[PDB]
Design a protein around this nucleic acid. Structure first.
Ligand SMILES: [Zn+2]
Ligand SMILES: [Zn+2]
Ligand SMILES: [Zn+2]
Length: 85
DNA sequence: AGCGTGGGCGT
DNA sequence: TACGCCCACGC
Protein backbone atom coordinates (compact mmCIF):
# COMPACT_ATOMS: atom_id res chain seq x y z
CA UNK A 1 0.00 0.00 0.00
CA UNK A 2 2.46 2.52 -1.33
CA UNK A 3 -0.30 4.91 -2.31
CA UNK A 4 -1.69 7.16 0.40
CA UNK A 5 -4.62 9.47 0.31
CA UNK A 6 -3.17 13.09 0.55
CA UNK A 7 -6.31 14.40 2.15
CA UNK A 8 -5.13 15.45 5.62
CA UNK A 9 -8.32 14.00 7.10
CA UNK A 10 -8.17 10.64 5.38
CA UNK A 11 -6.15 7.65 6.46
CA UNK A 12 -6.27 5.37 3.41
CA UNK A 13 -3.37 3.54 1.57
CA UNK A 14 -3.69 1.48 -1.63
CA UNK A 15 -1.78 -1.07 -3.63
CA UNK A 16 -2.30 0.41 -7.10
CA UNK A 17 -2.54 3.92 -8.41
CA UNK A 18 -6.03 3.32 -9.90
CA UNK A 19 -7.44 2.35 -6.53
CA UNK A 20 -6.32 5.78 -5.26
CA UNK A 21 -7.74 7.66 -8.21
CA UNK A 22 -11.02 5.93 -7.75
CA UNK A 23 -10.94 6.61 -4.01
CA UNK A 24 -10.20 10.34 -4.63
CA UNK A 25 -13.80 10.70 -5.90
CA UNK A 26 -15.11 10.54 -2.36
CA UNK A 27 -13.01 13.58 -1.65
CA UNK A 28 -13.69 15.46 -4.85
CA UNK A 29 -17.44 14.64 -5.22
CA UNK A 30 -16.85 13.61 -8.79
CA UNK A 31 -19.65 11.36 -10.07
CA UNK A 32 -18.75 10.65 -13.70
CA UNK A 33 -21.63 8.29 -14.55
CA UNK A 34 -25.14 9.51 -15.18
CA UNK A 35 -28.18 7.35 -15.20
CA UNK A 36 -29.79 7.80 -18.58
CA UNK A 37 -33.19 7.35 -17.01
CA UNK A 38 -33.27 9.33 -13.84
CA UNK A 39 -30.21 11.52 -14.51
CA UNK A 40 -28.80 10.54 -11.19
CA UNK A 41 -25.01 10.61 -10.96
CA UNK A 42 -22.71 7.92 -9.77
CA UNK A 43 -19.14 7.63 -8.79
CA UNK A 44 -18.71 4.21 -10.46
CA UNK A 45 -19.51 2.30 -13.65
CA UNK A 46 -20.40 -0.89 -12.00
CA UNK A 47 -22.65 0.88 -9.54
CA UNK A 48 -24.46 2.59 -12.36
CA UNK A 49 -25.17 -0.75 -14.14
CA UNK A 50 -26.69 -2.25 -11.07
CA UNK A 51 -28.76 0.85 -10.24
CA UNK A 52 -30.32 0.94 -13.74
CA UNK A 53 -31.76 -2.48 -12.91
CA UNK A 54 -34.02 -0.73 -10.43
CA UNK A 55 -35.56 1.03 -13.39
CA UNK A 56 -35.84 -1.85 -15.79
CA UNK A 57 -36.65 -4.56 -13.23
CA UNK A 58 -34.02 -6.84 -14.73
CA UNK A 59 -32.88 -9.61 -12.36
CA UNK A 60 -30.13 -11.75 -13.62
CA UNK A 61 -29.53 -13.92 -10.50
CA UNK A 62 -31.81 -16.67 -9.33
CA UNK A 63 -31.57 -18.83 -6.30
CA UNK A 64 -30.67 -22.43 -7.11
CA UNK A 65 -33.00 -23.83 -4.39
CA UNK A 66 -36.06 -21.79 -4.92
CA UNK A 67 -35.56 -19.86 -8.15
CA UNK A 68 -36.20 -16.50 -6.48
CA UNK A 69 -34.73 -13.67 -8.61
CA UNK A 70 -32.43 -10.81 -7.65
CA UNK A 71 -30.87 -7.81 -9.34
CA UNK A 72 -27.45 -8.46 -7.78
CA UNK A 73 -25.42 -11.49 -6.95
CA UNK A 74 -24.75 -10.22 -3.43
CA UNK A 75 -28.43 -10.15 -2.95
CA UNK A 76 -28.60 -13.71 -4.14
CA UNK A 77 -25.82 -14.74 -1.83
CA UNK A 78 -27.43 -13.12 1.18
CA UNK A 79 -30.63 -15.08 0.36
CA UNK A 80 -29.43 -18.65 -0.45
CA UNK A 81 -28.29 -18.76 3.16
CA UNK A 82 -31.85 -18.72 4.41
CA UNK A 83 -32.29 -22.20 3.10
CA UNK A 84 -30.11 -23.51 5.80
CA UNK A 85 -32.78 -21.86 8.12
C1' DA B 1 -35.96 -6.69 1.41
C1' DG B 2 -33.85 -3.16 -1.94
C1' DC B 3 -30.17 -0.87 -2.93
C1' DG B 4 -26.46 3.05 -2.21
C1' DT B 5 -21.67 2.51 -2.16
C1' DG B 6 -16.63 1.63 -0.70
C1' DG B 7 -12.51 -1.74 -1.02
C1' DG B 8 -9.62 -5.45 -3.46
C1' DC B 9 -8.21 -6.92 -7.50
C1' DG B 10 -7.99 -9.92 -12.29
C1' DT B 11 -7.66 -8.46 -16.50
C1' DT C 1 -5.33 4.08 -16.59
C1' DA C 2 -10.40 1.43 -17.20
C1' DC C 3 -13.86 -2.09 -16.51
C1' DG C 4 -16.44 -5.17 -14.03
C1' DC C 5 -16.62 -8.63 -10.85
C1' DC C 6 -16.96 -10.21 -5.72
C1' DC C 7 -17.48 -9.00 -1.29
C1' DA C 8 -19.17 -6.43 2.52
C1' DC C 9 -21.42 -2.76 5.26
C1' DG C 10 -25.19 0.36 6.17
C1' DC C 11 -29.81 2.05 6.10
ZN1 LIG D 1 -9.05 9.76 1.18
ZN1 LIG E 1 -31.59 5.95 -12.46
ZN1 LIG F 1 -33.99 -19.47 -2.46
Amino acid sequence: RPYACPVESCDRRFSRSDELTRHIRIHTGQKPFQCRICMRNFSRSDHLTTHIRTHTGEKPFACDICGRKFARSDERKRHTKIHLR
